[PDB]
Design an enzyme around this catalytic site. Sequence first.
Site, PDB file in Angstrom:
ATOM      1  N   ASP A 203     -26.004  19.611  -0.164  1.00 31.14           N
ATOM      2  CA  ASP A 203     -26.353  19.692  -1.073  1.00 31.14           C
ATOM      3  C   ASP A 203     -28.121  19.637  -1.721  1.00 31.14           C
ATOM      4  O   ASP A 203     -28.388  18.551  -2.470  1.00 31.14           O
ATOM      5  CB  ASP A 203     -25.967  18.053  -1.312  1.00 31.14           C
ATOM      6  CG  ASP A 203     -25.835  18.244  -2.894  1.00 31.14           C
ATOM      7  OD1 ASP A 203     -25.407  19.391  -3.954  1.00 31.14           O
ATOM      8  OD2 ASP A 203     -25.671  16.430  -3.390  1.00 31.14           O
TER       9      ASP A 203
ATOM     10  N   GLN B 245     -33.264  16.140  -6.796  1.00 32.13           N
ATOM     11  CA  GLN B 245     -32.900  14.989  -6.314  1.00 32.13           C
ATOM     12  C   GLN B 245     -32.609  14.563  -4.961  1.00 32.13           C
ATOM     13  O   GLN B 245     -32.874  12.562  -5.217  1.00 32.13           O
ATOM     14  CB  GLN B 245     -32.020  14.568  -7.554  1.00 32.13           C
ATOM     15  CG  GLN B 245     -30.494  15.484  -7.667  1.00 32.13           C
ATOM     16  CD  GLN B 245     -31.183  16.724  -8.453  1.00 32.13           C
ATOM     17  OE1 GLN B 245     -31.549  18.191  -8.941  1.00 32.13           O
ATOM     18  NE2 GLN B 245     -31.610  16.043  -9.368  1.00 32.13           N
TER      19      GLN B 245
ATOM     20  N   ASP C 227     -29.828  12.206   1.417  1.00 34.36           N
ATOM     21  CA  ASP C 227     -28.329  11.627   0.961  1.00 34.36           C
ATOM     22  C   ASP C 227     -27.643  13.423   1.624  1.00 34.36           C
ATOM     23  O   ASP C 227     -27.147  14.480   1.076  1.00 34.36           O
ATOM     24  CB  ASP C 227     -28.175  11.881  -0.436  1.00 34.36           C
ATOM     25  CG  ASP C 227     -26.670  11.789  -0.476  1.00 34.36           C
ATOM     26  OD1 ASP C 227     -26.224  11.235   0.302  1.00 34.36           O
ATOM     27  OD2 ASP C 227     -26.444  11.218  -1.984  1.00 34.36           O
TER      28      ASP C 227
HETATM   29 CL1  LIG Z   1     -37.949   4.704  -7.238  1.00 33.77          CL
HETATM   30  C1  LIG Z   1     -36.889   5.515  -5.925  1.00 33.77           C
HETATM   31  C2  LIG Z   1     -37.294   6.962  -7.080  1.00 33.77           C
HETATM   32  C3  LIG Z   1     -36.256   7.802  -5.589  1.00 33.77           C
HETATM   33  C4  LIG Z   1     -36.090   7.586  -4.449  1.00 33.77           C
HETATM   34  C5  LIG Z   1     -36.425   5.882  -3.855  1.00 33.77           C
HETATM   35  N1  LIG Z   1     -36.366   5.812  -3.002  1.00 33.77           N
HETATM   36  C6  LIG Z   1     -35.688   5.796  -1.751  1.00 33.77           C
HETATM   37  N2  LIG Z   1     -33.986   6.524  -2.484  1.00 33.77           N
HETATM   38  C7  LIG Z   1     -33.261   6.866  -1.338  1.00 33.77           C
HETATM   39  O1  LIG Z   1     -31.683   6.913  -1.565  1.00 33.77           O
HETATM   40  C8  LIG Z   1     -32.241   7.733  -3.293  1.00 33.77           C
HETATM   41  C9  LIG Z   1     -31.230   8.448  -4.130  1.00 33.77           C
HETATM   42  C10 LIG Z   1     -30.832   7.837  -5.324  1.00 33.77           C
HETATM   43  C11 LIG Z   1     -29.665   8.694  -6.088  1.00 33.77           C
HETATM   44  C12 LIG Z   1     -29.495  10.664  -5.825  1.00 33.77           C
HETATM   45  C13 LIG Z   1     -30.152  10.899  -3.986  1.00 33.77           C
HETATM   46  C14 LIG Z   1     -31.106   9.473  -3.539  1.00 33.77           C
HETATM   47  C15 LIG Z   1     -33.708   6.591   0.404  1.00 33.77           C
HETATM   48  N3  LIG Z   1     -32.896   6.644   1.086  1.00 33.77           N
HETATM   49  C16 LIG Z   1     -33.901   7.193   2.531  1.00 33.77           C
HETATM   50  N4  LIG Z   1     -35.095   6.210   1.496  1.00 33.77           N
HETATM   51  C17 LIG Z   1     -34.966   6.741   0.651  1.00 33.77           C
HETATM   52  N5  LIG Z   1     -36.308   6.389  -0.441  1.00 33.77           N
HETATM   53  C18 LIG Z   1     -37.303   5.206  -4.703  1.00 33.77           C
END
Ligand SMILES: Clc1cccc(Nc2nc(OCC3CCCCC3)c3[nH]cnc3n2)c1
Lengths: 297, 258
Positions: free
Chosen positions: A128, A132, A146
């Site tokens: 995937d 994003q 993800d």
């Molecule tokens: Cl403001 C901000 C903006 C983006 C990311 C993040 N941060 C962040 N997100 C995660 O999953 C985020 C997830 C959101 C939906 C789409 C797939 C990914 C994480 N998984 C481990 N570490 C992670 N850090 C923060």
Amino acid sequence: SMENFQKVEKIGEGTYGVVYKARNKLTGEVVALKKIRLDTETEGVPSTAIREISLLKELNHPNIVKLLDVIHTENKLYLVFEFLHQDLKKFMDASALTGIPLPLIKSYLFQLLQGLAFCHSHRVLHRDLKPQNLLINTEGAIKLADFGLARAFGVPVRTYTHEVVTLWYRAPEILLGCKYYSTAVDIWSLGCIFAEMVTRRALFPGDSEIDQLFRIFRTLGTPDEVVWPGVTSMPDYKPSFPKWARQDFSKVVPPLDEDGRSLLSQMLHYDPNKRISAKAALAHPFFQDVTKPVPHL
Amino acid sequence: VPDYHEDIHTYLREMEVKCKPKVGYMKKQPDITNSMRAILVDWLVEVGEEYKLQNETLHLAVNYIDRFLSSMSVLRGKLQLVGTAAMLLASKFEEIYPPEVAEFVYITDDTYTKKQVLRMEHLVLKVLTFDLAAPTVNQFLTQYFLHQQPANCKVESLAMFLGELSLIDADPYLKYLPSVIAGAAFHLALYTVTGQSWPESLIRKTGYTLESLKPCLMDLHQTYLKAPQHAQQSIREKYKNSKYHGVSLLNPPETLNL
Ligand SMILES: Clc1cccc(Nc2nc(OCC3CCCCC3)c3[nH]cnc3n2)c1
């Protein structure tokens, strides 16, 4: 159990569950918390969480989101992860009047290729890759995230799930119904991502499977037996497909230099056997001058 | 697409040591025995046949039961519940369409409720600390099959059959690592069908020779010879099918001349 975490805000929702930004009250560490609603007398722990957790505990790498802990309650499951600052899609959005400087593009691809070779050398398919699910920090890192659709593969591969990869990043061998797909599907995704970082628009934004196939065919030529032995016997291959002439790669991503075009064309080869592996791509001449500029947000 | 065949093989070699069940755990189980574990595994083979599960799913479930029983004491009336939860977890991890939890509840013929199956799923995850991507005899076989000159479908299905029979009997097979059992099953299948022996290209790959495979192979040979008499028979019946080329009613060699 969640007593030392203080929730800050909701980040978003990916393949399964919900992600939040949280703060460890005692250490100061900022983390992302993925909350997994369980229940009981339903299916129990979702196979997506089972695969994500068991695989991410094995995948310790600088370019792979680090799973720090799993808080497993009778009711809920919380995956604690290192916190990343933004997704690549939002970064490209924020850069679309100016564009991403070449050195940052190259560093990002180099880093993605490292994370991906490590996955593939540990028998894990991501399945995937899209902007994003690629997360950046303020120090110039970029990390695969993800792993909700990922899976462990075997040598040689058997048939795995057909409903894989977001459509704009989906390899041709998946679109055509091949019985067997492998690590080359993650490379095709990354090759679409590399083009997208450079043009800042999705390479192949189709709205359906056949639209997606025709978009790929109008850019790389409709595949034949010469370019891809076996293509014509694929399950969803149709002799009625329009035969488009292959476009000159300098017209596919106009700002890319010769080394860049050579690397992209090997990541988008039709035949998954000839498509470049992530390990081999790291020694491509495109990266001879790679450095690590950061990002900003 | 061999760019990672050797990195993967090396990594599975490292992980099978870490996923290895404790060799003498049955002598620490108050209420259950090797023979009770044989009955459970034979039953899981029947379940895998009934829902058309992969062989890999079966091998993973068994690895989960042996690692769970390595640190958790279990009464005999609950051994099927552990094996049911392990088979549910293995299906979720490996299968495209696992059976639903109600299907697992139904095939215990209501011995347990759905609530108990789900509570046991969670206990097995916590005991195994969610570490379910364990190397199996099947994953090593499939990589060994690539060294065949030419490929022989009888050799593959008979090596799978022998590898499966080793799941039933904790004594002696819990002493041998997945890669070693696969090396013995591959050699034994090959010698039974073609007269050929463990190829030199797999000595280079694995580092195992017929002398190092010898102890396992002597054990596996006896298992093969005695299969028609063993109290558990679901694997021989499954391997009567054409999907597995009818290999179970191939005749085992009388001697291996090693
Ligand atoms: Cl403001 C901000 C903006 C983006 C990311 C993040 N941060 C962040 N997100 C995660 O999953 C985020 C997830 C959101 C939906 C789409 C797939 C990914 C994480 N998984 C481990 N570490 C992670 N850090 C923060």
